[PDB]
Design a protein around this ligand. Structure first.
Ligand SMILES: O=N[O-]
Ligand SMILES: O=N[O-]
Ligand SMILES: O=N[O-]
Ligand SMILES: O=N[O-]
Ligand SMILES: O=N[O-]
Ligand SMILES: O=N[O-]
Ligand SMILES: O=N[O-]
Ligand SMILES: O=N[O-]
Ligand SMILES: O=N[O-]
Ligand SMILES: O=N[O-]
Ligand SMILES: O=N[O-]
Ligand SMILES: O=N[O-]
Ligand SMILES: O=N[O-]
Ligand SMILES: O=N[O-]
Ligand SMILES: O=N[O-]
Ligand SMILES: O=N[O-]
Ligand SMILES: O=N[O-]
Ligand SMILES: O=N[O-]
Ligand SMILES: [Cu+2]
Ligand SMILES: [Cu+2]
Ligand SMILES: [Cu+2]
Ligand SMILES: [Cu+2]
Ligand SMILES: [Cu+2]
Ligand SMILES: [Cu+2]
Lengths: 334, 334, 334
């Protein structure tokens, strides 16, 4: 086909955990979907202690924004590396075929930009990440990763082939950071990216993250930024981890339908308590809320969740169902 | 429904790896199933070296006992925290919906008790664990976790929808412990739970267990406490890990039918050598023994199994089948 | 049956990542397939730094060679431990039933040999490894593991039951090594296997590999030993990890059909980006190449891949498809 004959649509991305507007069932034929991302290297405070790192981001956030297209759309990404940055960057889409997912074609020095197009031939949620030759894990584990969702053109389906339609979608990007520690166990600090590199590699080689966070920081998806829903709403949570395994769990709920490894031609796993998203993968879980109140959404290595940062909240509005759960005798001495 | 119109049945739990009496196919309509558990904080020796920890238990054991109900039964748990204990505790059922799985409704100080009811709306094996706000992984990794099995009312089914019936069931709870170590690598000891807490958190944050055990101690499922079977028997092994991934394997056998993430509405995986149970999950594997002798049942990170403790035995009685395996030439010099 | 009435076929194995000649669909009835392996303890350089370890091998390689049979063939292995070796060895086949997978029947001192026969009753790819009582992880993590493929007699099938036929097959064995480190972080060296043992156990107990490699060394599957394919070829990659989880990923491609836990009676997972092979398992992924150029095949813990060694290359020949991917605007300043 002459791709120039296809419709074009532009999307300005939104900051995670929110997701740009889209339609589950495709309302048009195949399109070229145009996205622009601007790389930003920036300081970020990642914990309650005030630990500040030099993050490497797509569009200013950790994770980068969720892109949404349909199967056999074309993705056309304009990637900009402003001259205010220091490092070389590129992008690898796990959704794409060829050229190291695009990384071989998108190397941009500060002051440069590029435009890549690929055909989204497989439905699913997929990781994207920076991957400069020779320095790949340093960029990924500095926050330079996100995800793309390639919906089937007829939307999602259950294990029987019947439609599943979400009312709300959220994108939780989970980030392992490796802040270098000294003999005493104290975090070390660095003056330039080049002076940081060897100790960054040493810290990564421990295979022991210092922080594991959702949306870029301890507690980011809590408080005024808790996720929200109403009783009876159907919610899809897309979860990615570009480098390390995770095991999501909704405390007080389930994954009613889960694509743990994220690929929608497969039937979902039903009624999951907890599911394994391998490092380098995006997964998706669908749940219909049945009770109001606070939920915690966690990586169910509970050390990772409650000590290292991999925990967020939902605040759910609505009616309490005493058939489903009740306190028969409240805590008391007798 | 008026739950007061339903039958009630009481169960006194039994110590793992054994499981209280039940029927696979439900012989009654939906019931309220009454369980009582008494929390016991106690010293436990966890290894052959004599390392003694302060364990936190449901009903005196690590893991806590397996509860068995059927889909859409109600579980009514009386949870008792005697005044001989020191700490606050509660319970979160991954089988339940709402209130952090029950944890928000079951906080009991020493000297208190509570009764929780929930409807078991999803079939599967599920983790339960203590989860006091702000101290969750410390309680879980001190042994305060178990599992509940919610059987379909028509029992288990294979990948084709035909019945699978077990002759024996065992519950293997796998526990990661994090005994604090000093600079020399030596275990540290503590006088009160409060004096222990910070170094417990530091040890957990290494993400490196010091011990990984079945049924509470190195070698617990060996010797006079090896698991047993006969050739031709169908055995279900329920395996849980509340905090960390495991990968069970029957050395000399297989998982003929495996629900690795434990949820029975899904078809089982067939003929598994090894399967991944994510931390925060229970799984179940069904096997028909075909050869007698000693088997080892392990976490197949063999360091975890044979150095850190995650290994038990089966002793199987019966006929040897030389068609299936034989020594053609016994080890010899020639 | 009288096994003596069956055909016998002898196979001389080939060095990974190549695989001995075989037929996907069985061209004969059930056979006794005869294999011989000679154990070799040898020094191996495992990294670009020149780090040299004392490896324990089947047939001189890490991993050991891939054996290929069909379901309900018999495998007859002659295992030789020459008197030039120092240690006791044996073999455990995860494909086999009974006697700890054969390990109880195959213990050979230096100067001894043995012949084991077993029936390959379950289709799939499976790990085999040495497992001497009391020293199991030391042998496995010194390289003494490989895999066996038990093909269905009618070859591989997709999720719909239609045939899948590979044009090329490769075997990637992934090895975690634990070279002991001193206080300074420097590798330690040892004069005899007995003098090495305690520090080998200590290093293993860190659960932190020093090296994670394909085909026995950093960079082994690169350069003149890169894997190869042509555009349009169907390639099966069998991947094993006898001790530790891995998460394979083809950078620039996918797993079109993946048996992540390796057992062919199950339907494959479709369109995977990344898949989890649990430690103690072999998996298999099928892909049809669609673009030429260099691909990296990695464990997608990118630290494990690019810092610790778990990365190889494909070099793919053929036509570039600009519909699938193109550079619209090459990197430039504007
Ligand atoms: O970029 N990770 O959430
Ligand atoms: O800017 N280099 O492709
Ligand atoms: O039940 N979640 O910890
Ligand atoms: O140190 N982790 O939030
Ligand atoms: O939305 N329930 O009141
Ligand atoms: O909950 N009233 O005892
Ligand atoms: O409590 N864990 O076996
Ligand atoms: O004892 N407090 O719910
Ligand atoms: O074959 N189990 O180590
Ligand atoms: O030190 N583990 O049994
Ligand atoms: O139970 N077999 O003799
Ligand atoms: O096993 N007899 O040589
Ligand atoms: O032996 N492992 O590649
Ligand atoms: O050489 N011992 O079986
Ligand atoms: O996209 N692989 O790093
Ligand atoms: O130190 N690893 O190649
Ligand atoms: O094989 N493609 O030119
Ligand atoms: O790629 N030409 O601007
Ligand atoms: Cu970058
Ligand atoms: Cu990648
Ligand atoms: Cu507790
Ligand atoms: Cu939990
Ligand atoms: Cu050996
Ligand atoms: Cu094994």
């Amino acid at each position: 086909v002459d791709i120039s004959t296809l419709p074009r649509v532009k999307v300005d991305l939104v900051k995670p955990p929110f997701v740009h507007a889209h339609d589950q069932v495709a309302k048009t034929g195949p399109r070229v979907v145009e996205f622009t991302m601007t790389i930003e290297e920036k300081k970020l405070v990642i914990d309650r202690e005030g630990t500040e790192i030099h993050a490497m981001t797509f569009n200013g956030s950790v994770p980068g924004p969720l892109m949404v297209v349909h199967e056999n759309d074309y993705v056309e990404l304009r990637l900009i590396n402003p001259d205010t940055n220091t490092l070389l960057h590129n992008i690898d889409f796990h959704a794409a075929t060829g050229a190291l997912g695009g990384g071989a074609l998108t190397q941009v020095n500060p002051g440069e930009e590029t435009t890549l197009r690929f055909k989204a031939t497989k439905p699913g949620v997929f990781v994207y990440h920076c991957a400069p030759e020779g320095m790949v894990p340093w960029h990924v584990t500095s926050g330079m990763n996100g995800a793309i969702m390639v919906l089937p053109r007829d939307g999602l389906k259950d294990e029987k082939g019947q439609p599943l339609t979400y009312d709300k979608i959220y994108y939780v990007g989970e980030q392992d950071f490796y802040v270098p520690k000294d003999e005493a166990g104290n975090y070390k600090k660095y003056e330039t990216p080049g002076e940081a590199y060897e100790d960054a590699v040493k810290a990564m080689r421990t295979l022991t993250p210092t922080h594991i966070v959702f949306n870029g920081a301890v507690g980011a998806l809590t408080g005024d930024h808790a996720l929200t829903a109403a009783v009876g709403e159907r919610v899809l949570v897309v979860h990615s981890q570009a480098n390390r395994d995770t095991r999501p769990h909704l405390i007080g709920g389930h994954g009613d339908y889960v694509w743990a490894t994220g690929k929608f031609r497969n039937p979902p796993d039903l009624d999951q308590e907890t599911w394994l998203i391998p490092g380098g993968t995006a997964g998706a879980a669908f749940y219909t809320f049945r009770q109001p109140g606070v939920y915690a959404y966690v990586n169910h290595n509970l050390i990772e969740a409650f000590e290292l940062g991999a925990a967020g909240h939902f605040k759910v509005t609505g009616e309490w169902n005493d058939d489903l759960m009740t306190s028969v005798v409240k805590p008391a001495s007798m």
